[PDB]
Amino acid sequence: IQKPYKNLAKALQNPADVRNLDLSFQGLKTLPNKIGQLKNLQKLDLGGNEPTILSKEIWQLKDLQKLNLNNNKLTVLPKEIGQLQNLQELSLHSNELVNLPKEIGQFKNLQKLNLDNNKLTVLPKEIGQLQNLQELSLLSNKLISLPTEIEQLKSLKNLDLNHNEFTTVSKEVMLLETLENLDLRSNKLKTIPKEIRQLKSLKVLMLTGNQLTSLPKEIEQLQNLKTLNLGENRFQIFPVEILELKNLLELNLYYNQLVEFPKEVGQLKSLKYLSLYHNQITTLPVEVTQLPDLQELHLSGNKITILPKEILQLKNLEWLSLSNNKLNALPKEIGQLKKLQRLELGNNQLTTLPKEIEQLKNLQRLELDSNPISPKEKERIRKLLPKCEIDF
Ligand SMILES: [Zn+2]
Ligand SMILES: [Zn+2]
Ligand SMILES: [Zn+2]
Ligand SMILES: [Zn+2]
Incomplete structure (x- = not known):
């Protein structure tokens, strides 16, 4: 590992010693022919220059392991890129690519491929030849499908399809059993396949910003799942399948149309984070207070009228959000939430807070705007929590 040569003149003075060259954002239009003298080059950054920076001399620098061609207004990738047999990391992000040459499949040792922020409508069938690929990033493209040969990516751990035009997840993506992180955010998904x-092996599944109404029963088999992000979808019926995932740590279901917060949520015993912000929830079941490791509970923008006294059981809770609800009171048991740092209660029907709130020694912020709290009550509250930032 070498500190990058940022000065092209310095690099060309002792070319044999140049392993790392960073010419990014230098206003370079072309490369000098002399660049071919950098025979031991392993890392090359040509990002943020011009499309003409793609000198034919680059494709003869055979020791190249890492190549960044980001932000170069590239409309086409030369077929000669395939000659860089030793490439491990290739970055083509923020360009104007519509297609890729079939030669993209020649990188036998390719581990990371970044194609973020392009205009890709299709991937070549040869993408399946990248059998050592661990990460494929396709954020913000125009893909409606992946080639069936995607099933051949037997080492893939990270697949990012965030901001594309997918209407269904192909059964070939589902054959990538080594996947750990699958990002399908901001697509047009209506269903998830059985x-x-x-x-x-899936640890993270991100489906935020789609049109999902339900999940298949088969999702219960994702026993390695830690993060499940289902916010900004069309769930009206709570997907009870996800309540079988006893090792889940984070669950996001905000911006749905959920009418029921089921008692079975109590079966998510490892849950650390739960958001049900902006739904139609009316009642908080006692079973949610039975989550011993819960640190964040986000319930703002609902129709909750009361909190059960069993809230005291959430000993690890640090953040409780209940703004824009219909809360008439807080139980005195709120004072037992010793780790609470943030309590959002704006836009409710609160007139007072129990004396026991003074026990919230770690409380840093308390939100109480748009509540019918009288000036003398605001004074009392300030005195109960003198070190807390209180918004009235
Ligand atoms: Zn988009
Ligand atoms: Zn929205
Ligand atoms: Zn709203
Ligand atoms: Zn707030």
């Missing part, structure tokens, strides 16, 4: 059960 074949999701095959992704047994």
Whole structure:
């Protein structure tokens, strides 16, 4: 590992010693022919220059392991890129690529491929030849499908399809059993296939910003799942399948149309984070207070009228959000939440807070705007929590 040569003149003075060259954002239009003298080059950054920076001399620098061609207004990738047999990391992000050459499949040792922020409508069938690929990033493209040969990516751990045009998840993506992180955010998904059960190594599944109404029963088989992000979807019926995931740590279901907060949520015993912000929830079941490791509970923008006294059981809770609800009171048991740092209660029907709130020694912020609290009550509250930032 070498500190990068940022001065092209310095690099060309002792070319044999140049392993790392960073010419990014230097206003370079072309490369000098002399660049071919950098025979031991392993890392090359040509990002943020011009499309003409792609000198034919680059493709003869055979020791190249890492190449960054980001922000170069590239409309086409030369077929000669395939000659860089030793490439491990290739970055083509923030360009204007619509297609890729079939030669993209020649990188036998390719581990990371970044194609973020392009205009890709299709991937070549040869993408399947990248059998050592661990990360494929396609954020913000125009893909409606992936080639069936995507099933051949037997080492893939990270697949990022965030901001594309997918209407369904292909059954070939579901054959990538080594996947750990699958990002399908901001697509046009209406369903998740039953074949999701095959992704047994999946730790993170992001489906935020789609049109999902339900999940298949087979999602219960994702026993390695830690993060499940289902916010900004069309769930009206709570997907009870996800309540079988006893090792889940984070669950996001905000911006749905949920009418019921089921008692079975109490079965998510490892849950640390739960958001149900902006739904139609009326009642908080006693079973939610039975989550011993819960640190954040986000319930703002609902129709909750009361909190059960069993709230005291959430000993690890640090953040409780209940703004824009219909709360008439807080139970005195709120004072037992010793780790509470943030308590959002704006836009409710609160007139007072129990004396026991003074026990909230770690409380840093308390939000009480748009509540019918009288000036003398605001004074009393300030005195109960003198070190807390209180917004009235
Ligand atoms: Zn988008
Ligand atoms: Zn929205
Ligand atoms: Zn709203
Ligand atoms: Zn707030």
